[PDB]
A paper describes a structure:
To promote generation of new piRNA, Krimper uses its two Tudor domains to bind Aub and Ago3 in opposite modification and piRNA-loading states. Overall, our results reveal that the two Tudor domains of Krimper have distinct architectures that are responsible for the differential binding of two PIWI proteins.
The overall structure is similar to eTud2 apart from the C-terminal region (484-511aa) that forms a long α-helical fold that inserts into the narrow interface between the Tudor and SN-like subdomains. We named this novel C-terminal helical topology the “latch helix”. Furthermore, eTud1 possesses a ‘latch helix’ that must move out of the cleft to allow Ago3 binding providing a potential regulatory mechanism. Pro292 within this N-terminal loop forms a CH-π interaction with Tyr365, Glu297 in the loop region forms a hydrogen bonding with the backbone of Ser387, Arg300 in the loop forms a hydrogen bond and salt bridge interactions with Asp394, while Tyr304 in the loop forms cation-π interaction with Arg428 in the SN-like domain. All these intramolecular interactions help to stabilize the overall structure of eTud1. Although the overall topology of eTud1 is similar to other extended Tudor domains, eTud1 has its own unique folding and recognition characteristics. The unusual binding preference of eTud1 is reflected in its non-canonical binding pocket, which lacks three of the four conserved aromatic residues.
Residue numbers in the entry: 287 to 465, 483 to 511
Write the structure that this text describes.
Amino acid sequence: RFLLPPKGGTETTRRDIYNQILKDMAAFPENTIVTAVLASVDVTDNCAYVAKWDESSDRIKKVLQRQLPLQELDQLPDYGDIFAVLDSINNIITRITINSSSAGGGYDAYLIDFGEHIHFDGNETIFKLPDDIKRLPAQAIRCDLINCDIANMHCFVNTYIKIRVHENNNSTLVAEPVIITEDDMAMLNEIDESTSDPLKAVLGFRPK
């Protein structure tokens, strides 16, 4: 059975949903070199995403590695509201928001911690986050990477990199890449299997 459609909220574009979610811009100070995970490289939209994945994000990490039980949901939350979705094949649970209704069926959704826009069929297994996790800042910060080969940068997704922050306007970054607990690396391997899944682009996240 499909999830019930959202009862409320304002539908938004991919650019707008990124603007509406909470983001910790203080983690990327200008004129400094910082260590961050290359969350995603969108070679169709040019821009990349960086995530601090700092000790303050520990609750999100616990949900992602299925270390915390969550209440399964049958009613999609409102557009712009934050919840969790299960990638059943790769066994990880990630934070998500529905930004709009799709004309052909389903919805447009944003993976706030990965910086990825995906189609949401409405058959996906979804959960309610506890309020503290729900209120945590989105890990993925939009970043214009300069002086580098973006295509080559795509292979370094889900790895720690060092970036020189040229500009931090408070919604996006202009950064140049420069050429960490054991649990953090283990989590990145778990994320990479979901990200590298051969059918993720075609089917999105699979149910059950």
